[PDB]
Ligand binder design. Structure first.
Ligand SMILES: Nc1nc2c(ncn2[C@@H]2O[C@H](COP(=O)(O)OP(=O)(O)O)[C@@H](O)[C@H]2O)c(=O)[nH]1
Ligand SMILES: [Mg+2]
Length: 299
């Protein structure tokens, strides 16, 4: 059934295990704006895999392979949060090497994580087929995994099957990054769709319910802190009370919930400003926008 899936996955593992090889294989042609414009939030979008039936956004976690003295108290909190918000974890491991401390350090960080962890044995091309099941068993002694999938990221052996399996674990969801619009960085579409989801929870309906979200600005204030301006657009000012509510109470709750989901996923602390505006037809028209709503969220 023809029902579109989308989500956030993080590819974790020690250096030289194949993470960028995998990313660059599956994502296809690299998005141009991602190397013009730097991303304001912390947790870097690696790229966008779009098939007809699904879209996956690859997010960087912090270096959970690192020992605790190198990745501090704060960047652990960011890493554990990001791993919860994410839809799936790709734990990528070298088939051709013995288990080092870096993989034990990752296993420690995945202990009280409830997100699906996929064990991806990479570099199976450097190894006899009968070597895979013993190595799988080495890792299974440490923890349970959701699926175990041997690949070669370089050759492409078993990659498409891995993606088919990975897609089954995604929720139903929007195409975050579209084909029409090359101009803005995909982080803006991630924030835009998060805001929109919080609005559509309130609607919760099959009254025909048209609402839009624009993100007017995203600005890095610090390595932790980002300022988002966004305008929610509605038809009909009587949509106050779906969206603004009794003295702004409903718009605060949207602002609070969207701020949290942006902080947890993308790893930067936010100062969110939301506007709510009514848009009538604009083509050859004067005074088609009336504001009905403003909120401010932080700390
Ligand atoms: N033989 C083999 N080499 C691979 C495979 N995947 C990646 N490599 C190579 O192993 C290295 C891994 O580096 P990279 O992909 O940058 O991994 P990262 O540090 O995890 O991003 C590169 O020299 C890749 O060409 C694979 O499946 N088989
Ligand atoms: Mg590398």
């Amino acid at each position: 059934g023809t029902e579109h899936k989308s989500g956030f996955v993080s590819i974790i593992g020690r250096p030289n295990v194949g993470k960028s090889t995998f990313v660059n294989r599956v994502i296809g042609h690299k998005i141009a704006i991602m190397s013009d414009k730097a991303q304001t939030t912390r947790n870097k979008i690696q790229g966008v895999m779009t098939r007809d039936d699904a879209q996956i956004i690859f997010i960087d976690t912090p270096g959970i392979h690192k020992p605790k003295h190198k990745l501090g108290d704060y960047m652990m909190k960011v890493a554990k949060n990001t791993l919860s918000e994410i839809d799936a974890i790709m734990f990528m491991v070298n088939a051709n090497e013995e288990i080092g401390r870096g993989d034990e350090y990752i296993i420690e960080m995945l202990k009280n994580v409830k997100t699906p962890v996929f064990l991806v044995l990479n570099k199976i091309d450097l190894v006899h087929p009968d070597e895979l099941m013993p190595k799988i068993e080495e890792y299974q002694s440490y923890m349970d995994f959701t699926e175990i999938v041997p690949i070669s990221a370089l050759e492409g052996l078993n990659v498409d099957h891995f993606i088919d399996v990975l897609k089954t674990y995604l929720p139903e969801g929007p195409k975050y990054y579209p084909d029409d619009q090359i101009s803005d960085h995909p982080e803006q579409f991630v924030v835009g769709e998060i805001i929109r989801e919080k609005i559509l929870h309130l609607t919760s309906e099959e009254i025909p319910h048209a609402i839009g979200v624009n993100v007017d600005r995203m600005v890095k204030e610090s390595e932790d802190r980002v300022h988002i301006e966004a305008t929610i657009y509605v038809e009909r000012g009587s949509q106050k009370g779906i969206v603004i509510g009794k003295g702004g109470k409903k718009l605060k709750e949207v602002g609070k919930r969207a701020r949290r989901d942006i902080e947890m996923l993308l790893g930067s602390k936010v100062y969110l400003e939301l506007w709510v505006k009514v848009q009538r037809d604009w083509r050859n028209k004067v005074n088609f926008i009336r504001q009905i709503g403003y909120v401010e969220d932080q700390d």
